[PDB]
Amino acid sequence: AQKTFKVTADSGIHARPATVLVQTASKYDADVNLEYNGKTVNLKSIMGVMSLGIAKGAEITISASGADENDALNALEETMKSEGLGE
């Protein structure tokens, strides 16, 4: 269960928002993951995400796969648009 987004964020995935997204993923049992420029990091890992160095523009792909990969990808979307991080 996935979906691409176009980082609408002004600063990209960084600061608190980044923390917000990463945490949202940790809310679910599913194996939420994130892909970017040919590199997949756990979306539940503050380090993996913040190490990719995202920024306005570049599009990303938020993966997912678990007994709740559905509600998960939904939630991730919420916050993704709650902190103006792509769409």
């Binding site: 600061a15 608190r16 990719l52 160095g53």
Partner: protein, 332 residues
């Protein structure tokens, strides 16, 4: 006269040893007993005494944070990442200002270490060999945030300050500038004299441009030291075409110092600050800067610490976060 597990243990015809089990959510507790003692803990308004626990468990769920001056605009942000990730991971924090003073930095380390911290995040400006020795002596994990440690012995987390200033200097030459100046911070700090300066002198001899031993101004991150930094430079005969400030607070001082001399930005000169704080955006014109994920630097640091504190294996201790350049209006 706080109520301990004993009172609760009495107020539930059970042993204090099982009251403990409930509190920490031990599985091996019959539902009747648990639910019975849970309403008891509330019926007495009980709150566990962490100190008591920490003596026994040898764990305090608290990390120590040694920061130079938490009043700054830079570090304060860093402190947010640090603080915020630690909460994520259920870890309180002990903040303490060192003011880049060594006797203090070391003294604090000892104090926190004494208060049995599960780990520490050190944000220093001059990590000597003596710090290393002290560091290697901590019984708990120590992570460095946005700091430059030559020895490369303690696990740090930051951006490449060397390649960072380089990218800038380049972009500046990659636009015509030939007489570019660098207003660094107290050279006494290994991050100025050995990382920021190098990336400046390197990107110059890398573009043939002769190193101008008078284009290197030494500020102190202050808004005023930057003001006086631009007044000294526009005094010499061979005055710079563009100037690069080690930070935003020195960069702003520069922009204004020029306008104070009738100079116009970016018309007359091209400035580029560093760190990319709220400051480099609340100015007219807006400050161009080498973006530094300050929050990410701290948040990552705290994350990495969480790992070490859990003995969990960690590939590579020294971490480097990606940096970039964001131009606003202080450049043509």
């Amino acid at each position: 006269m706080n109520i301990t597990i004993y009172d609760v243990a009495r107020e539930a015809n059970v042993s204090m040893a099982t009251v403990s089990r409930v509190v920490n959510g031990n599985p091996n507790v019959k539902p009747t007993t648990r639910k019975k003692v849970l309403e008891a803990i509330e019926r007495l308004g009980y709150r566990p005494n962490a100190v008591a626990r920490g003596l026994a468990s040898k764990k305090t769920t608290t990390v120590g944070v040694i920061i130079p001056d938490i009043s700054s605009i830079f570090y304060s942000e860093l402190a947010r990442g640090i603080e915020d990730i630690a909460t994520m991971y259920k870890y309180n924090i002990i903040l303490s200002n060192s003011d880049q003073n060594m006797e203090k930095e070391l003294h604090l380390l000892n104090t926190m270490l004494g208060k049995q911290v599960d780990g520490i995040v050190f944000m220093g400006g001059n990590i000597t060999d003596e710090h290393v020795a002290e560091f290697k002596r901590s019984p708990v994990p120590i992570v460095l945030a946005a700091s430059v440690e030559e020895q490369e012995e303690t696990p740090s987390v930051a951006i490449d300050y060397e390649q960072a200033i380089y990218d800038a200097v380049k972009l500046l030459v990659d636009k015509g500038h030939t007489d570019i100046a660098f207003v660094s911070g107290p050279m006494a700090e290994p991050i100025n004299r050995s990382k920021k300066l190098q990336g400046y002198k390197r990107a110059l001899e890398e573009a043939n441009l002769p190193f101008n031993e008078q284009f290197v101004a030494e500020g102190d991150y202050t808004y005023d030291s930057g003001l006086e930094a631009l007044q000294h430079l526009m005094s010499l005969d061979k005055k710079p075409t563009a100037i690069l400030s080690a930070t935003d607070e020195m960069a702003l001082g520069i922009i204004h110092a020029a306008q104070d001399q009738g100079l116009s930005i970016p018309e007359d000169l091209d400035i580029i600050g560093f760190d990319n704080t709220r400051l480099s955006l609340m100015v007219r014109p807006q400050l161009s800067t080498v973006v530094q994920p300050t929050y990410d630097i701290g948040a990552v640091a705290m994350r990495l610490l969480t790992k070490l504190m859990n003995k969990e294996p960690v590939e590579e201790h020294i971490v480097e976060l990606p940096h970039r350049i964001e131009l606003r209006k202080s450049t043509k």
